[PDB]
Design a protein around this ligand. Structure first.
Ligand SMILES: Nc1ncnc2c1ncn2[C@@H]1O[C@H](COP(=O)(O)OP(=O)(O)OP(O)(O)=S)[C@@H](O)[C@H]1O
Ligand SMILES: Nc1ncnc2c1ncn2[C@@H]1O[C@H](COP(=O)(O)OP(=O)(O)OP(O)(O)=S)[C@@H](O)[C@H]1O
Ligand SMILES: [Cl-]
Ligand SMILES: [Mg+2]
Ligand SMILES: [Mg+2]
Lengths: 724, 11
């Protein structure tokens, strides 16, 4: 294994003519940043590119774009030889031709809009036969280098002339399309796409290798998540990137056919896949074929489910075939399919978080010229409850808007197309703001699972409590070894209790943020919403999701609402089931359960039993010092006048809760706003506003309440015996 | 069809 041999890996630099190595390997081969390297792949093909450094890149691998990958007839994980190329000199004339299926809709000067800015100030090293991709004018066209004066390879200097005269050449049989789906078309679910890659890469990429080992590979992988999350997308991507044969089975399509045809088509699909192994059979909308057995009333329907189960069992032949399936509702699928030997591996492709949505927005703005005022991060932040498909649609909609208002001119040209103008089309931030108002988000009702953006900085006071939370949650995650030496197993869960509006919810999210661990919030009322009969499967679904997202902190907020509802046969079944789930929850799984209640007087003692929420943390009203910290936190984002004294404000609000102070800021902020409108000034919030707001300010926690809360702080653990 | 005929480079 000489140093020149390296393994292909994902790319970070979107540039076509760029490949990356690690500094230690770049020094090993004796190459530097400016150097032009020659890459030799399989099938006796070659590609030339500029080399760069990458600290993240492992020395045994090389990052190259999918364009470079194709020019080499290579895939992820393959081996290629790299050797220095100082022999590259500037070109005299270059001849590139477009590929028919990517240019048949546009007319005009293809060279000025695409090739011009692509090679401008680029000095790209190219090779004869290479296919490169240029995106612009809401389209991506790929050209193939037909010839270069210094053949077979040369750099494109300003002196090099270009000729792109000619009817687009037709697609060669072996030349795979770059319009086809790949991993670079997927974002917002890195972790999941990784899991699938691990499961599938080995048996699909190295089939002979798996047959010799005798260890069992995966056969059934079930992707699930709301509609439009990219389940169908991932299946296609994995097939292309691994180079496996892809046979799609659409649930509805099969169920639209006669009894005999459905049975027949399923058979053929499997037979065809085995014929072209290695292969991936993807069953889209699986629930269409195999819903819960109780809902599958009908003879023809029952036969097809059984037909599928048998075919799945028939995969014991081990004909290098993987079966992937997608369903919106994991509970809808006949449980017979989730049994071992069939779909025995599941991957939850949930809804994207802020970071994810941003990743996605970037995917569908590749080909569009974006104005400077456009801020996708805002859009991402703003489009909560949006799913991949939602984002993909709004981008199309924001583009279509830019066309409409700019169509005034095009119409007179409709007869023909204005390619040169298509580039002049920019998409303003307004075009997104417009599309934002018109958006119909689908996954708002979905339970969100992501890392909270609430940090310790957002919480005033409670310093020692933050400390105790790091010991309970962070230490066992970051320092498992230490716990084993002392021979103690760490506690499973925590219970926040105290007066309303003191930061119980904030603490739950904060500790999750510190551990960069997933967070799931489920408020009392949410648990009382689930239909009575349905309640049983939903509580379980929650803990399942918590396991999927480990390390994860599961937070049961507003527990007092459920307490009031019991003393309710529904509220009883739920909490009793949560208790059951808690016990089944192994502490070793790194799932932390936190509960919060404003009413420790009516909380179910069962929840406080050792092994459950046995860590009783009291969270009181903020003392003088803390109140100042809270006031700063809320006023961080706001323009405050220098005259406003918060140390005094805190001194006057002894007994006020954290939420009360926030409300005071809001009321004082509302006064400043009022004055900004009536009299046209940049608003500032000054002493007079706080004084006026304070005169009407009221306290949410009475003295009587305090006395009671203080008493429970010393006697809450005693509620498991006889009541007080 | 073949090779060249026209112009480009610019810059
Ligand atoms: N994670 C994602 N990353 C990038 N694009 C996405 C993502 N998810 C969805 N999209 C886009 O939205 C479209 C919908 O993706 P789909 O493959 O249809 O997901 P889906 O879950 O199979 O949809 P359903 O369940 O059949 S409604 C795709 O064509 C993508 O363009
Ligand atoms: N320590 C604090 N620091 C900053 N803001 C606070 C603090 N405590 C309370 N608040 C404010 O009160 C709001 C809600 O606080 P929570 O985290 O929900 O505390 P809580 O114990 O759950 O009380 P409730 O019943 O939800 S109001 C937040 O949006 C804050 O604006
Ligand atoms: Cl309770
Ligand atoms: Mg789909
Ligand atoms: Mg709260």
């Amino acid at each position: 294994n000489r140093p020149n041999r390296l393994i292909v890996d994902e790319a970070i630099n979107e540039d076509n003519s760029v490949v990356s190595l690690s500094q230690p390997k770049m020094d090993e081969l004796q190459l530097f940043r400016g150097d032009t390297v020659l890459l030799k792949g399989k099938k006796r093909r070659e590609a030339v590119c500029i080399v760069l450094s990458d600290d993240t890149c492992s020395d045994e691998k090389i990052r190259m774009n999918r364009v470079v990958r194709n020019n080499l007839r290579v895939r992820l994980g393959d081996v290629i030889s790299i050797q220095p190329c100082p022999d590259v000199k500037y070109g005299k004339r270059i001849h590139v031709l477009p590929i028919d299926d990517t240019v048949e809709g546009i007319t005009g000067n293809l060279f000025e809009v695409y090739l011009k800015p692509y090679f401008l100030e680029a000095y790209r090293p190219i090779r004869k036969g290479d296919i490169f991709l240029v995106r612009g004018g809401m389209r991506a066209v790929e050209f193939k280098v037909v010839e270069t004066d210094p053949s077979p390879y040369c750099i494109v200097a300003p002196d090099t002339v270009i000729h792109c005269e000619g009817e687009p050449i037709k697609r060669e049989d072996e030349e795979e399309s770059l319009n086809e789906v790949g991993y670079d078309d997927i974002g917002g679910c890195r972790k999941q796409l990784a899991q699938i890659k691990e499961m599938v890469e080995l048996p699909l990429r190295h089939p002979a290798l798996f047959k010799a080992i005798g260890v069992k590979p995966p056969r059934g992988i079930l992707l699930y998540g709301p509609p439009g999350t990219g389940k169908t997308l991932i299946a296609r991507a994995v097939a292309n990137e691994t180079g496996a044969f892809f046979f799609l089975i659409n649930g509805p399509e099969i169920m639209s056919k006669l009894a005999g045809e459905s049975e027949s088509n399923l058979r053929k699909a499997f037979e065809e896949a085995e014929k072209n192994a290695p292969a991936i059979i993807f069953i889209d909308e699986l629930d269409a074929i195999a819903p819960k057995r109780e809902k599958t009333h009908g003879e023809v329907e029952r036969r097809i489910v059984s037909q599928l189960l048998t075919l799945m069992d028939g995969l014991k032949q081990r004909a290098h075939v993987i079966v992937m399936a997608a369903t919106n509702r994991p509970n809808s699928i006949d449980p017979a399919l989730r049994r071992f030997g069939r779909f025995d591996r599941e991957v939850d492709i949930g809804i994207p978080d802020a970071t994810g949505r941003l990743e996605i927005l970037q995917i569908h703005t590749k080909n569009m010229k974006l104005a400077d005022d456009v801020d996708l991060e805002q859009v991402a932040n703003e489009t909560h409850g949006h799913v991949g498909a939602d984002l993909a649609a709004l981008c199309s909609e924001a583009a279509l808007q830019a066309i409409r208002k700019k169509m005034d001119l095009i119409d007179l040209e409709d007869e023909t197309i204005d390619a040169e103008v298509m580039n002049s089309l920019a998409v303003t931030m307004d075009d997104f703001r417009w599309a934002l108002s018109q958006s119909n988000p689908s996954a708002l009702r979905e339970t969100v699972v992501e890392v909270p953006q609430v940090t310790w900085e957002d919480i005033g006071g409670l310093e020692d409590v933050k400390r105790e939370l790091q010991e309970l949650v962070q230490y066992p995650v970051e320092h498992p070894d230490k716990f084993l030496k002392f021979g103690m197993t760490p506690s499973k869960g925590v219970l926040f209790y105290g007066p309303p509006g003191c930061g119980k919810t904030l603490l739950a999210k904060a500790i999750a943020n510190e551990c960069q661990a997933n967070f799931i919030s489920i408020k009392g009322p949410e648990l009382l919403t689930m239909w009575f009969g349905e309640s049983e499967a939903n509580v379980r679904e929650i803990f399942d999701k918590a396991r999927q997202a480990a390390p994860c902190v599961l937070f049961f907020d507003e527990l007092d609402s459920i307490a009031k509802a019991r003393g309710g046969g529904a509220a009883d079944r739920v909490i009793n089931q949560i208790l059951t789930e808690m016990d089944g929850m192994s502490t070793k799984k790194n799932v932390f359960i936190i509960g919060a209640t404003n009413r420790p007087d009516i909380i179910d003692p069962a929840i406080l039993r050792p092994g459950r929420l046995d860590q009783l943390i009291y969270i009181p009203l903020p003392d003088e010092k803390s109140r100042v910290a809270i006031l700063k936190a809320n006023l961080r984002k706001s323009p405050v006048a220098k005259d406003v004294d918060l140390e005094f404000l805190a001194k006057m609000t002894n007994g006020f809760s954290g939420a009360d102070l926030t409300e005071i800021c809001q009321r004082a902020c509302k006064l400043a706003i009022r004055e900004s409108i009536e009299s046209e000034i940049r608003p500032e919030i000054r002493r007079d506003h706080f004084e006026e707001a304070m005169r009407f300010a009221r306290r949410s926690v009475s003295d009587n309440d305090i006395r009671k809360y203080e008493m429970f702080a010393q006697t809450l653990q005693q509620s498991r015996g006889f009541g007080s | 069809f073949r090779a060249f005929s026209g112009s480009g480079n610019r810059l």
